[PDB]
């Protein structure tokens, strides 16, 4: 297939006799198949072959669509290895997976082929855009589900499950991430998953979750307040807005995604809340809920028509909670479009 | 010189005896088992021969500084972590820790060497305290709860993500954090998949169900196998199933110490292969369980783990026949003094 060609003539450039691809997703978006238990893809000048363990080899062999190979123990796979000079591998790859390939395959140097993998990866097919899309609205229906279930007393777990079951109900695999009901002070923490906290009167409540639908991830979160909000609480949440809002409308080919957290990080400074919004303003999504590119002041990625990626700036401030608004978009050919499309004027 | 717990002492000591300057623990279940933290980002445990020292990014400092029973660092970019690991020979690492991750220690950190620690988090590990064997028990009470609604669910016309669903949510609101891998809820044909989870696949009469499902509870695993039949078994049917409850039974009866996992495997793959189904028991006997789902010891025929008191393990046989059908039947055992417990109750004989 085109994406094994692509790997080739980056084994041509680099010098490299044979790749090995294991980690779940590359495995998945490389061969179609997606072995729970560990697979492995060889792709050689001329060929490209699934590796996987008795176990896996009739699910293997009905959804790849390279020639599969099963094996009883890893001692058969290394010998289909050994020769091999120099190994194109996963930055991923574990050091006892590594140091087995030195003394069972005998290989002489490694090197990584990342950027091939990101290179494809990072650019998402007509088919890819049509399945995260329709994860996005499974997870825009969580959030509705959420919102409808959050009242005062109420766990924030019993939240979290009742949203999961949902997803699944609708066809996803399972949530993309452990869901977040994060209310009260927890609005402010870093990663407030779902916890026994029961949710009070007055709670700024944080929603993030998305979910795995057919491999693909979905990404959104959205704040809302258990009655009235206060002062400072309505304060955060405007500007979040508002920088959000400006992000999403700043997207599109071209321009790196270092200029696009700049553009919410200086809306956020400039009304003297910087030191409140301590993460980057989002990052891609795909075969992972986290992959290509980083969407941060590190990050001068040039964005281009295909890539997903989600918007969330946000504010938090101990004990009086946080407010973040996130969003999966889709860079288009002359801007961006939300895939996530639940209503963020919620306060 | 820091007062360090034991776990972190018994490192120590491997690290002595193999000449290594230093150890790195990076793998959440390792960080949590030695800490009691369980930093989401990136926490990292530098162990040298007086101090142990758990490190994390800003945004995990405080929840780690209030669980963690090791002194915590915090660092704003990972420069600072490679500086404090400057000067560190040889560095004991897990078989874990990936490759790009090694790549920046040699050239930062100027690590000059590195050693596997897996021994020594193995020894540890892979045998449970009494503490944690009642974690686990209670992780298995879950289940078991999961696995009778799941078949009091099952039934002609349902779908069985749904019934994958139900279940999920049940075990949540019975106290697990989530699900401890993947439900498997595989009818007809799709039983013949050892990993066949729970699909948009609906449920017919006459289909054999393997229910596989866990709980992540307290910070452990549980996990359970069950397989029944919508209806009335067909004679072929009803025979593998008896091939499998068998083996299943004499492997479990046999489990005790002393034994080692290869022998037992042996015990159930020799039961079923004189059947002549020795090619559809296409997987190992069971694997241990602890903070992680899949762990030491591997019940196979390429493990001479010498079982000991202390060990969990499942005992899960199966035979699984292509676009037809299969059966599995799995319990989470502990091994003891002379014989073994079943943690997981749920009756076996369901068919
Ligand atoms: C909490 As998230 C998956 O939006 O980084
Ligand atoms: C599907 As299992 C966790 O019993 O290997
Ligand atoms: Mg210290
Ligand atoms: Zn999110
Ligand atoms: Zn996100
Ligand atoms: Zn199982
Ligand atoms: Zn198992």
């Known amino acids: 297939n085109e994406k094994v060609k692509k790997i080739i003539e980056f084994m041509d450039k680099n010098s490299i006799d044979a790749v090995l691809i294991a980690k779940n997703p590359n495995v998945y978006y490389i061969s179609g198949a997606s072995p729970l238990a560990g697979g492995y893809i060889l792709i050689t000048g001329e060929s490209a072959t699934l590796y996987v363990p008795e176990l896996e080899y009739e699910m293997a062999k009905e959804e790849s669509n390279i020639p599969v190979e099963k094996f009883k123990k890893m001692d058969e796979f290394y010998k289909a290895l050994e020769g091999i000079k120099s190994l194109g591998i996963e930055s991923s790859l574990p050091y006892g997976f590594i140091e087995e390939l030195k003394k069972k395959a005998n290989i002489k140097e ?25 994860a996005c609205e499974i997870a825009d229906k969580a959030v509705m589900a959420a919102i409808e279930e959050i009242t005062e007393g109420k766990k924030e777990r019993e939240v979290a499950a009742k949203v999961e079951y949902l997803m ?7 949530p993309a991430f452990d869901t977040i009901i994060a209310s009260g002070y927890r609005s402010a ?30 990404d959104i979160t959205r704040t809302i307040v258990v009655g009235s909000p206060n002062e400072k609480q309505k304060e955060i949440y405007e500007i979040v807005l508002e920088a959000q809002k400006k992000a999403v409308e700043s997207a599109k080919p071209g321009i790196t995604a270092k200029e696009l957290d ?71 050919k002359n801007g961006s479009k939300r895939l996530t499309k639940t209503e963020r004027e919620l306060i």
């Open 189 to 218: 923490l870093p990663h407030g998953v779902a916890s026994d906290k029961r949710i009070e009167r007055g709670d700024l409540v944080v929603i993030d979750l998305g979910a795995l639908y057919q491999h693909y991830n979905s």
């Open 168 to 174: 699944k109900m609708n066809g996803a695999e399972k």
């Open 110 to 134: 490694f090197k990584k082929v990342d950027d091939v993998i990101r290179d494809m990866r990072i650019i998402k097919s007509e088919k890819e855009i049509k399945i995260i899309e329709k």
């Open 262 to 332: 700049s553009i919410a990080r200086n809306i956020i400074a400039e009304y003297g809340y910087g030191e409140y919004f301590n993460h980057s303003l989002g990052h891609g999504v795909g075969l992972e809920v986290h992959e290509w590119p980083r969407v941060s002041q590190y990050d001068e990625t040039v964005l281009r028509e295909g890539m997903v990626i989600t918007i969330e700036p946000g504010i938090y401030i101990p004990k009086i909670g946080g407010v973040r608004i996130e969003d999966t978009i889709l860079i288009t």
